[PDB]
Amino acid sequence: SNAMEVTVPATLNVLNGSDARLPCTFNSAYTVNHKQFSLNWTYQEANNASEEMFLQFRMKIINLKLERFQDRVEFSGNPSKYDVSVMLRNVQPEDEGIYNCYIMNPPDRHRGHGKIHLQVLME
């Protein structure tokens, strides 16, 4: 094909105080090689705000411990089965925003992008 298919919910609605799993799966002809696979997760308050990386895969999962998320971010995927989902525990109203997943799976030439708008409902 001409692109890496990435499957995410365009809008994700979560009750304040609950856990938010951000689902992100992708398609590729090639087995994921942990020594070359790349994964980037970023947050932005809005489309015109800067992206803040909070998780990366380089050889292993790297949790950047972004301050706005405390220690509530967990990797919730499995690259060997094409799942790069993240978990956000105990969501607060400030977690509302745009979450981007960027994927590269060498030697696959196409790179992937998923974009989720997380909205926090009143509890």
Author numbering: 27 to 149
What does the paper say about this structure?
Voltage-gated sodium (Nav) channels are part of membrane-embedded signaling complexes that initiate the rising phase of action potentials, a crucial event in generating and propagating electrical signals throughout the human body. As key components of these protein assemblies, β-subunits (1) modify Nav channel-gating properties; (2) regulate channel trafficking and localization to distinct surface compartments; and (3) influence channel oligomerization. Structurally, β-subunits are single-transmembrane segment glycoproteins with a short cytoplasmic C-terminal tail and a large V-type immunoglobulin (Ig) extracellular domain that may participate in homophilic and heterophilic interactions, cell adhesion, and cell migration. Of the four known β-subunits and their splice variants (β1–4; gene names Scn1b-Scn4b), β2 and β4 form a disulfide bond with an unidentified Cys within particular Nav channel isoforms.
In addition to 55Cys, the hβ2 crystal structure reveals a unique motif bearing a protruding disulfide-stabilized loop formed by 72Cys and 75Cys. To determine if this loop regulates the gating or pharmacological influence of hβ2 on hNav1.2, we mutated 72Cys and 75Cys to Ala (C72A C75A) but found that it is functionally indistinguishable from WT hβ2. The lack of effect of the C72A C75A mutant on hNav1.2 function suggests that this disulfide bond is not essential for folding, and that its disruption may not significantly affect the position or environment of 55Cys. To verify this hypothesis, we produced recombinant hβ2 extracellular domain containing three Cys mutations: C55A, C72A, and C75A. Size exclusion chromatography demonstrates that the mutant produces monomeric protein, indicating that the bond between 72Cys and 75Cys is unessential for folding. Furthermore, we obtained a crystal structure of the triple mutant at 1.85Å which overlays well onto the C55A structure. The only significant difference is situated in the loop containing both cysteines, which now displays a single conformation. Although the spatial organization of this loop does not seem to impact the ability of hβ2 to modulate hNav1.2 gating or sensitivity to ProTx-II, this region may yet play a functional role in modulating other Nav channel isoforms.
